[PDB]
Amino acid sequence: ALTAQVALVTGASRGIGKATALALAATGMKVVVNYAQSSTAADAVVAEIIANGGEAIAVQANVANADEVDQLIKTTLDKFSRIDVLVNNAGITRDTLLLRMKLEDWQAVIDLNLTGVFLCTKAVSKLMLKQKSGRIINITSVAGMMGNPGQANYSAAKAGVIGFTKTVAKELASRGVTVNAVAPGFIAPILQFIPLARYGQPEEVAGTIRFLATDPAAAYITGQTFNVDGGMVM
């Protein structure tokens, strides 16, 4: 039951991750609020969760580093003893046109946004396969789907995440574990590409993540990419 389930959300301190943490806890899930450096933001997310009648803890971990991913999971299990949903939300950008892009700026975006997804997903997969249940939601981006100048690294990483999602969905499906992606568009030069003529709100992405993560209907949904983008892609 949702009130006994546990969610791990990476980079959950602000924006989409914060809203996702709040949304998941609102369904009754216990939530691990992961952060890299911004402990204060994370503590405030936890506080809000507790104020609204839920449980949560803030755990520091840079999810580009395997060692720290292990510890993030370890701490999550110590406190809550299980993991039911993983939301891979941690990411960075280092925008620059291709011809100016330093290797380190390519590599840092690949390391966290793509390899970080591999590391966390591999770590929770074993747990989910054992208990024969689980839902994994990877945060991709419209940039990954349509391309966007100045983001050759970010779009490569985010598209990588989508391909990774489809494969892992197929690997874990026999145990009923779902694996999906959510693609936010422009979330609070731009509006001409957004039919709904406004920026999205983080709650709107969070609500969609929460549908995939917790709705009984989404037990039969896996390997998909759900866009929350005002109509930007299709």
By CB under 8 A, residue 205 contacts a copy of itself: yes
Nearer to a copy of itself, 59 or 145 (CB): 145
**By C-alpha distance, which of 47, 80, 42, 40 is closest to 58?**
42
**By C-alpha distance, which of 113, 116, 128 is closest to 171?**
128
Nearer to a copy of itself, 28 or 176 (CB): 176
Distance CA 9, CA 86 (A): 6
CB of 70 to a copy of itself, least distance (A): 28
Per-residue x/- marks for a copy of itself, 168-197, CB under 8 A? -xx--xx-x-x----------------xxx
By CB under 8 A, residue 215 contacts a copy of itself: yes
Distance CA 62, CA 11 (A): 9
Nearer to a copy of itself, 54 or 202 (CB): 202
- CB atoms under 10 Å from CB of 30, counted, come to 24
Distance CA 138, CA 158 (A): 9
By CB under 8 A, residue 230 contacts a copy of itself: yes
Distance CA 44, CA 90 (A): 18
> Is 154 a catalytic site residue?
yes
Nearer to a copy of itself, 57 or 142 (CB): 142
By CB under 8 A, residue 217 contacts a copy of itself: yes
By CB under 8 A, residue 133 contacts a copy of itself: no
Structure-token pair, residue 45: 């997310």
By CB under 8 A, residue 166 contacts a copy of itself: yes
By CB under 8 A, residue 103 contacts a copy of itself: no
Q: Of 35, 154, 199, 220, which one is the catalytic site residue?
A: 154
Backbone angle region of 230, left / alpha / beta, with phi > 0 → left and psi within -120 to 50 → alpha: left
Strands 56-60 and 85-88: unpaired
**Interacting residues with a copy of itself (CB under 8 A):** 166, 169-170, 173-174, 176, 178, 195-198, 200-201, 203-208, 210-211, 215-231, 233-234
Residues known to be catalytic = 154
